[PDB]
Amino acid sequence: AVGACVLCNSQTSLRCGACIRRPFLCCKCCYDHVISTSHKLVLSVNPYVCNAPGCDVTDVTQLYLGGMSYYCKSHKPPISFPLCANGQVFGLYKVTDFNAIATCDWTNAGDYILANTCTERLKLFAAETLKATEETFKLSYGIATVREVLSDRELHLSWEVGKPRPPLNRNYVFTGYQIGEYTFEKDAVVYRGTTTYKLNVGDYFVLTSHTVMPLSAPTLVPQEHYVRITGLYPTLNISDEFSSNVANYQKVGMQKYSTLQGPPGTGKSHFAIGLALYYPSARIVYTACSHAAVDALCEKALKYLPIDKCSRIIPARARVECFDKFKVNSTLEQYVFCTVNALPETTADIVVFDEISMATNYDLSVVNARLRAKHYVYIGDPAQLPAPRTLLTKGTLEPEYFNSVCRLMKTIGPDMFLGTCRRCPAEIVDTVSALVYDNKLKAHKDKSAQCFKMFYKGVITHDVSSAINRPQIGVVREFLTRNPAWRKAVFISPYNSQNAVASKILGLPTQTVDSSQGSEYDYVIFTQTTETAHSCNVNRFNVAITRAKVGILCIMSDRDLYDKLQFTSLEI
Ligand SMILES: CS(=O)(=O)NCCc1ccccc1
Ligand SMILES: [Zn+2]
Numbered sequence: 001a002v003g004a005c006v007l008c009n010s011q012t013s014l015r016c017g018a019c020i021r022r023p024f025l026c027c028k029c030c031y032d033h034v035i036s037t038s039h040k041l042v043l044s045v046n047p048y049v050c051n052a053p054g055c056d057v058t059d060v061t062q063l064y065l066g067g068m069s070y071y072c073k074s075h076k077p078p079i080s081f082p083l084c085a086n087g088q089v090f091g092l093y094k095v096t097d098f099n100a101i102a103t104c105d106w107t108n109a110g111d112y113i114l115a116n117t118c119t120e121r122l123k124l125f126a127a128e129t130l131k132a133t134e135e136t137f138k139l140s141y142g143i144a145t146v147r148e149v150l151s152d153r154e155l156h157l158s159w160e161v162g163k164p165r166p167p168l169n170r171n172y173v174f175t176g177y178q179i180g181e182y183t184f185e186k187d188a189v190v191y192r193g194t195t196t197y198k199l200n201v202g203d204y205f206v207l208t209s210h211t212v213m214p215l216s217a218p219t220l221v222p223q224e225h226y227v228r229i230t231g232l233y234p235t236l237n238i239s240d241e242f243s244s245n246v247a248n249y250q251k252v253g254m255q256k257y258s259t260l261q262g263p264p265g266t267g268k269s270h271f272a273i274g275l276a277l278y279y280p281s282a283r284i285v286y287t288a289c290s291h292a293a294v295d296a297l298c299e300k301a302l303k304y305l306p307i308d309k310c311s312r313i314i315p316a317r318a319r320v321e322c323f324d325k326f327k328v329n330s331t332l333e334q335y336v337f338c339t340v341n342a343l344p345e346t347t348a349d350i351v352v353f354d355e356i357s358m359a360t361n362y363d364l365s366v367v368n369a370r371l372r373a374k375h376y377v378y379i380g381d382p383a384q385l386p387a388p389r390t391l392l393t394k395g396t397l398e399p400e401y402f403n404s405v406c407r408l409m410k411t412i413g414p415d416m417f418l419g420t421c422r423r424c425p426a427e428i429v430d431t432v433s434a435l436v437y438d439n440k441l442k443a444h445k446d447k448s449a450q451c452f453k454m455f456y457k458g459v460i461t462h463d464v465s466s467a468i469n470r471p472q473i474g475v476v477r478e479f480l481t482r483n484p485a486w487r488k489a490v491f492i493s494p495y496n497s498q499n500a501v502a503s504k505i506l507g508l509p510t511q512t513v514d515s516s517q518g519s520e521y522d523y524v525i526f527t528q529t530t531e532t533a534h535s536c537n538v539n540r541f542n543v544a545i546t547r548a549k550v551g552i553l554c555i556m557s558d559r560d561l562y563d564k565l566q567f568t569s570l571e572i
C-alpha cells in the first residue's frame, strides 16, 4: 500500500479504488481526482470507508478521521477531521487529463488523442487502463459451441443466447476447450486450429482473455545526443549496397533513439540489416508486434548476416508458423528476432523496432522494460496502418496519435526519411506521394502503364457488418478474361467477406489491406467494396495500392480517391 503518485511521483498510502488499475495518488492529486470524478473510493493500508458497524458510506468526500479510524458525518466522533479538505485527502507524507483517462470507456478517438498528448507517466497509466479495459471487455461476448463438423477446414456453430456474437476475422483469436487457439472466416464457417485437432461436436470456444501486467519503463527513454558514435564500432569496409545509409547509420550511433519513416518499398529491412553490417560487432535485437514483421527482418538477415549469429525467439504458446532457417530460442546469439510479446529480459548495443505504426504505447513501454540498449531505432511509416483499437467506435485515430514514435514523426518529423520507392510503378508512387507524403516520395521505377482505375459503385451487401460487392467482383472477372497476365494477381479489399466471395468466384489468392501491409506482389486487384471511413482511410488506401510491383487494377467506390489515382481509367 506504499507507492509513488502516478502523476507527480510524491509517495503515498492513497490508491484510487475506482480506477480499474488502482493507481497510487498523492494527497494533493487524489483530492483533484475524487472531487471532479464519480471516483470516490480511496484505498490506503485499509479502505477509506466508515468503520461504524452496518454503515456502507465509502465516499471519501463524505468521510472523517475519528482519532485512528474513519467515519461518515452520521457516525464521526466530536473531534473528527474531514478526509477531504484544503485541496488534499488525508494520508501519509502529506490532473484534468488524469481524470479523463481514469473515467473514459475508450470508444472515442479523443480518448486515444489525450493518451498520446499527456505527460509520459499518464501515457503509461492510459496504456495499462486501455489494455485492462480491452481485456475485461472480452468477457462480455457469447460462447461458440460446435453444432456439426463438415470437413477438416469447415464447421457449423451454435452461439450463447443473451450475449453478443463477436466478429469472425483472423484478428479475434479464440481459445478452444485446452485444445489450442482457433480462428474463423464466414451458413458455412471456415475453422483454422493454430493446433490441428479433429474438431468435436459439443466442444466450445471462448476469447483469449490475457492478464495486463503493469508498465514501468517509459514509451520513449529520454533523448540523448552525442558528439561521437557512442558504444558502437563502425567499419571502413561497408558494402556499396549500404553506402547510401552510412550518414544515417552514424546518426543512429550519435543519439540514444532515432526514428526512420520509410514509405512502402524504400528499403526499411535493408536499412535495419545494413545497420548490423555497419556496426558488425554490435549485438542487435530485431523486434516488431507481428510474426510477419519479424519474419521479414529474418528473411533480410538470412541474405546478409551470418546464419550462425542469428536466433528467431518463438514463444512456447506458438500461435502461427514463422521463420525456420535460424536457431530457435537462443537468446544470446549476436542477432535476435522476436515479437514484442515474447522478448526476453536482455541488453543490446542496438534495438531495432520495426513496423512502428502497428505499435501501441503499451508495446513501446514493454520494449524499454525487457531490453536495456545503448541505441533504439524505430522504423516504420505513420502513413501506414495502426494497431486495431477494438474498443474505438467513434472518431478516426489520426497517425500523430498512433503512439509516441508516430506522434514525434508527425510533429517534429522523423530523424531519417527513405525518400525513393524502388517497388512501385511511378503511377502509384505519384498518387501516394501527393496523398500522404507531401510530394517528398520519389519514384525509381517508370510508369508501368499497367495501373488501372474503374469507378464502379456496384451493390453492397453485408455478412453482418463485413461488406461484399458482387458487381465489383464481376467487373474483375470480366477484366481477367481480357487481361490473362493478371491471373497471377493477389486480390485485395478492405473486407474479409469480400475476399471470401472473391476467392470462390476469381480463385485468386486473397488479402485484406491490413494483412497485405509489409508484402509486395507483381499484380494487385483492389476492390474498395464500400464508401465507408474504413475503405476511404487514406492510410489503408496508401497501403492497398503500394503492394504492387508491376500492375494494379482499382475498382473504386469513392470519387475523391478515384480521381486522385494517377492511373489509366477503364470502361464497362
Ligand atoms: C496506475 S498504473 O498501474 O497504470 N501505472 C501507472 C503508469 C506508470 C508506472 C510506472 C511509472 C510511471 C507510470
Ligand atoms: Zn479513479
Ligand SMILES: [Zn+2]
Residues within 6 Å of the ligand: 005, 006, 007, 008, 009, 010, 025, 026, 027, 028, 029, 030
Ligand atoms: Zn500526485
Ligand SMILES: [Zn+2]
Residues within 6 Å of the ligand: 050, 051, 052, 055, 056, 057, 071, 072, 073, 074, 075
Ligand atoms: Zn457511517
